[PDB]
Subunit: 76 residues, 2 copies
């Protein structure tokens, strides 16, 4: 599995990045029956003014297929 995490900018040191990756890894192993070697994880920082593009391409068009829908909306 390949997991992509997009979020607003924040400072994460190497220890933080590795711990987040480890917690994500174990969740994926549990739910998808995956092996550790099959998992890759990306963390991409997105500036606030570029979040609309993420909403438009990834969130809004897939809304009822999302496994977790956003509590916020960019189309109010």
């Amino acid at each position: 599995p390949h997991i992509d995490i997009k979020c607003f900018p924040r400072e994460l040191d190497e220890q933080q990045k590795a711990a987040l990756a480890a917690d994500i890894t174990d969740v994926i192993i549990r739910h998808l029956n995956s092996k550790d070697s099959s998992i890759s994880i990306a963390l991409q920082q997105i500036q606030p003014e570029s979040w609309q593009a993420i909403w438009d391409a990834e969130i809004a068009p897939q809304m009822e297929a999302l496994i977790k829908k956003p509590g916020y909306s960019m189309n109010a």
Copy 2:
């Protein structure tokens, strides 16, 4: 944060997809100082013969930045 999970196909019912979403949500809240309302999660099942496109567009180019690198290589 918006989380995208790509994996080879598997039989997952709605309760199973919600349980995966809940565990991912906890991890994101605790590591990114996030809130339930800010989190959206997509799950996309990709047939094995279409994984090369994922390697080429998402995994390989980001190798320098991934927070968890894959345990396999598929450069073609």
